[PDB]
Amino acid sequence: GMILLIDNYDSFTWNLYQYFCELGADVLVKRNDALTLADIDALKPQKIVISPGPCTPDEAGISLDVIRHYAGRLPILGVCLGHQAMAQAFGGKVVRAAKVMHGKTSPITHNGEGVFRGLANPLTVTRYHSLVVEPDSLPACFDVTAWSETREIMGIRHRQWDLEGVQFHPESILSEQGHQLLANFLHR
Amino acid sequence: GHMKTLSPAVITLLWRQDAAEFYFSRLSHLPWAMLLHSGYADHPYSRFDIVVAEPICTLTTFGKETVVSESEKRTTTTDDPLQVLQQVLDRADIRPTHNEDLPFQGGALGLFGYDLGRRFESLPEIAEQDIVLPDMAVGIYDWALIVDHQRHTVSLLSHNDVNARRAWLESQQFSPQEDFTLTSDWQSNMTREQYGEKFRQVQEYLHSGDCYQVNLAQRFHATYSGDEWQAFLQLNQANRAPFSAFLRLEQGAILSLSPERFILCDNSEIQTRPIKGTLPRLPDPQEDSKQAVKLANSAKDRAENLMIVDLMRNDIGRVAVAGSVKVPELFVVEPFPAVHHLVSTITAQLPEQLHASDLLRAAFPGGSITGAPKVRAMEIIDELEPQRRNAWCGSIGYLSFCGNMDTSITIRTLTAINGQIFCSAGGGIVADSQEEAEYQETFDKVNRILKQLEK
Ligand SMILES: N[C@@H](Cc1c[nH]c2ccccc12)C(=O)O
Ligand SMILES: [Cl-]
Ligand SMILES: [Cl-]
Ligand SMILES: [Cl-]
Ligand SMILES: [Cl-]
Ligand SMILES: [Cl-]
Ligand SMILES: [Cl-]
Ligand SMILES: [Cl-]
Ligand SMILES: [Cl-]
Ligand SMILES: [Mg+2]
């Protein structure tokens, strides 16, 4: 249906736009300071995607507020910063990774659930992040759906709601099965 | 009666390989005379040289204000400069069909300075504005001289009286001026120590997650005397760069030896070819072949290049037809006289409701000379670079009346103004970068230009 893609001033957001449009979605992109929660209510999106972006969830404009308000009401996907924001919105903590991964691919292992349904395991994904969700801090309401080779959280899923984060970029040219990963979110 | 969809009238002139430099010589002193030159490069995108002069309309942007000038009429506007440009193009009532042999059929040609990006994103004002040269300086031309190295044809096209334009051209006489001389040594706007401090601040932002790559540049300044066109003739021969240009502006001269295409729009087919990755050419040919292989397989450079590929997919993806964005080429090495460059190619399709000018607005300035994420990287560049970039790392090119566009990134580009000449050099800073190697790479990219002008 109609997807609202919240843009955290990012230079990867329109790759998500292109993938969702290719899959047949109607997509609106709005910057994280161009929208209020009242405007979202007027747009009546079917699903929301929180984009990647610089800095931390605290610098992600309306992103944390949207996650808290629409959690369990419309499906939400968080990508990279969006994934971090989703963890933070329910009490998680975002910390520096052991090693920054900027334009580097990694094999990740998942449980074949949520956006990983039907995907190969392991899966090679592009990373563009300096920060991760601290595993110790992760709220009880989330399962870890995917791990890096060094046991960093690469994905989370809310145990009740359609609320899912991935730390990597399915929309990167060197990510495996990125269209199908997003198709899982679009068509569930 | 008025609207013209008719193909322009064409006179074929005598074929000579040097036709563009030959004809441009007699125009090079005129404000709004402009040359796009393929550098005589052995290169897949070295086909055309384009010459224009005597515009019917000019657009000059300094900050918020664009001045549109026609023979006896001058208008000032704070509107989006690319919307103003599109309106001016539309109002010419010249609408020819695409021609594979005439990629520019008249239209807009000139400079989009890096600081024009301040019209499309809110950016801080820390770096000093010490060069007074327009953020946009574009002429509107109803004729062009096209040199085609593939067909070996020189075509003079005009939407008016092509025989009158040919007579005008053969009536201009080349009266050569004093040769170019540098009258000071080159000096940088930063010491090795200042470069280090800036480099280390970029590394802090990389580790904090503010950014993934930042293009950090220093600027070389000298005084000069004599004719900028004579300097360009020397530099063009030495650089063999396929996106070279000479612009004579009201305020000074831009001498571009860019090897880099920004955005092509060719019958609605979009191409961008970001350069990200460099190694110096080595004198021993066996060593130099090894050097090209080392670049192609460098883990650090392939990471930086991949990032800018994903970024250029995004920038083009703001307007591209859904499903049209492709990467036909990843990590190809192109050799230039000074350096090997790692180049990738992204393609897409422009929707019929949009214009090349809308694609330019969506993408400007190039991801390849800013970083990722782009807005954060431009904030950091403004924080650390002592002066605004002005013409450097903007774009030169054309928006044809047919809808076509081609643009460069103005790397390897000199600004010559008020007897001062400026030449900047940058590189991508990423987490694996080394401070001394990145300092030295800036010299590797322009040393041959600095040294050619010094004697
Ligand atoms: N190389 C381009 C023409 C060109 C030369 N210099 C340029 C500068 C900007 C844009 C285009 C150009 C071609 O063959 O078509
Ligand atoms: Cl917006
Ligand atoms: Cl930390
Ligand atoms: Cl690291
Ligand atoms: Cl300004
Ligand atoms: Cl310090
Ligand atoms: Cl580079
Ligand atoms: Cl390979
Ligand atoms: Cl450079
Ligand atoms: Mg490099």
Residue numbers in the entry:
A (entry chain AAA): 0 to 187
B (entry chain DDD): -1 to 453
Question: Which sentences from the paper describe this structure?
Answer:
Here, we chose aminodeoxychorismate synthase (ADCS) from Escherichia coli, which consists of a class I glutaminase subunit (PabA) and a synthase subunit (PabB), to investigate the mechanism of glutaminase catalysis regulation and its impact on overall GAT activity. PabB catalyzes the amination of chorismate (Cho) to 4-amino-4-deoxy-chorismate, which is a committed step in folic acid biosynthesis. GATs comprise minimally a glutaminase that produces ammonia, which reacts with a synthase-bound substrate to yield specific nitrogen-containing products. As evidenced by analytical gel filtration and isothermal titration calorimetry (ITC) data, the PabA and PabB subunits form a heterodimeric assembly with a dissociation constant KD = 0.16 ± 0.06 μM.
When Gln was added to the crystallization buffer, we found a glutamyl thioester (Gln-TE) adduct covalently bound to the catalytic aC79 within the glutaminase active site in only one of the two PabA/PabB heterodimers, indicating that under the given crystallization conditions the glutaminase reaction proceeded only to the Gln-TE adduct without performing the final hydrolysis step. This finding is most likely due to structural restraints imposed by the crystal lattice, in line with similar observations in other GAT structures. When Gln forms a covalent adduct with the catalytic aC79, as expected, the glutaminase catalytic triad residue aH168 is in a catalytically competent position, allowing a nucleophilic attack of water on the reactive carbon atom to reconstitute free aC79. In the ADCS structures with Gln-TE bound in the glutaminase active site, we consistently observed a distinct water molecule interacting with active site residues aY127 and aH168. This water molecule is in an appropriate position to hydrolyze the Gln-TE, as illustrated by a close distance of less than 3 Å to the Gln-TE reactive carbon atom, which is subject for nucleophilic acyl substitution, and hence it is referred to as the glutaminase catalytic water molecule. Finally, the reactive carbonyl group of Gln-TE interacts with the main chain amino groups of aG52 and aL80, which together form the oxyanion hole required for glutaminase catalysis by polarization of its carbonyl group. We also found several interactions between the noncatalytic amino group of Gln-TE and residues of both ADCS subunits, including bG207 and bY210 from the PabB subunit, allowing the catalytic center of Gln-TE to be positioned with very high spatial precision, to generate a catalytically competent glutaminase active site arrangement at the PabA/PabB interface. Indeed, we found a rotation by approximately 23° in the principal axis orientation of PabA and PabB subunits induced by the presence of Gln-TE.
